[PDB]
């Protein structure tokens, strides 16, 4: 379909962050970047992006990106959309529930892209 995506997430509760490891995609099918969008709401703090990797539709960014601030009920509530685009147009996204991490440990996930 539209390619793959690799990362890890990482919820530590001490700190109250949660690490995104944005590690690969595979077979992606049109310069990619990934945008992580912490849900609800628009707010700056709650968008961040890896750098842009070129040419190419296998880009690998092993790149972490975290938040901070996040608490129990963030874990409960809220929703890690992650969107793969192509730098100057949108390649394809996934939609994380954060209550399918547990405190402290790391979940890997390897996911079919979407156009939804």
Known sequence: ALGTLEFDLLYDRASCTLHCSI???KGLKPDPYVKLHLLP???K????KTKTQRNTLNPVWNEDLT???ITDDDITHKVLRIA???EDEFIGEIRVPLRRLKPSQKKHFNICLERQ
């Open 23 to 25: 590690l690969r995609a």
């Open 41 to 43: 709401g628009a707010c």
């Open 45 to 48: 703090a709650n968008k961040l």
């Open 67 to 69: 938040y901070s601030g």
């Open 84 to 86: 793969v685009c192509d």
